[PDB]
């Protein structure tokens, strides 16, 4: 008679968090296609408002997309992986962010975690994630004191919300995987 417990390895590499809220988590049929992951966005939203959704810390390490919570770093909300990751994208608004990873077969689970104040940061490490080396902070901002002022032109439209859209719009399949037959002929 004697006692005994057993703990895993600690994982320890270079790894990127990001301040977000836990909506919640909705199974999805399809593994790609807008309508079934936005369908899976507001189910969650219905259920639990803005307040109602916990803070947590979203881990995006190099092709590895761990959750874990506020109350507790050791707290593994949910482990994605970007291999698994088959298909992503942003919902109608831009400070949310929703992702379709494999939980096995054919079923695949859909997560949802708002962006504040968007997901321009966020959707752009997860979908960056899946080629490998990330840009990141682009450096070149806004100078101030303009020179040549008093024409049409040069728009004053943010780099943030054109990128946002697009994963809103056509959003990003992961390459990886390729396990399923839409080659056409």
């Not at 400070?95 to 079923?107: E, K, P, V, Y």
């Not at 946002?164 to 399923?180: H, I």
């Amino acid at each position: 008679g004697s006692s005994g417990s057993s703990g895993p390895t600690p994982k320890t590499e270079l790894v990127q968090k990001f301040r977000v809220q836990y909506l919640g988590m909705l199974p999805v049929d399809r593994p790609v296609g807008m309508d079934t992951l936005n369908s899976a966005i507001e189910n969650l939203m219905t259920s639990s408002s803005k307040e109602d959704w916990p803070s947590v810390n979203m881990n995006v390490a190099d092709a590895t997309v761990t959750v874990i919570s506020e109350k507790n770093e050791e707290e593994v909300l949910v482990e994605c992986r970007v291999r698994f990751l088959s298909f992503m994208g942003v919902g109608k608004d831009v400070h949310t962010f929703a992702f379709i990873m494999d939980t096995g077969n054919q079923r695949f689970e859909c997560h949802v975690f708002w962006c504040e104040p968007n997901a321009a940061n966020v959707s752009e490490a997860v979908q960056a994630a899946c080629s490998g080396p990330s840009s990141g902070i682009e450096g070149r901002g806004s100078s101030g004191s303009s020179g040549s002022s008093g024409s049409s032109g040069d728009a004053a439209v943010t780099p943030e919300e054109r990128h946002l859209s697009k994963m809103q719009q056509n959003g990003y399949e992961n390459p990886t995987y390729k396990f399923f037959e839409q080659m056409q002929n």
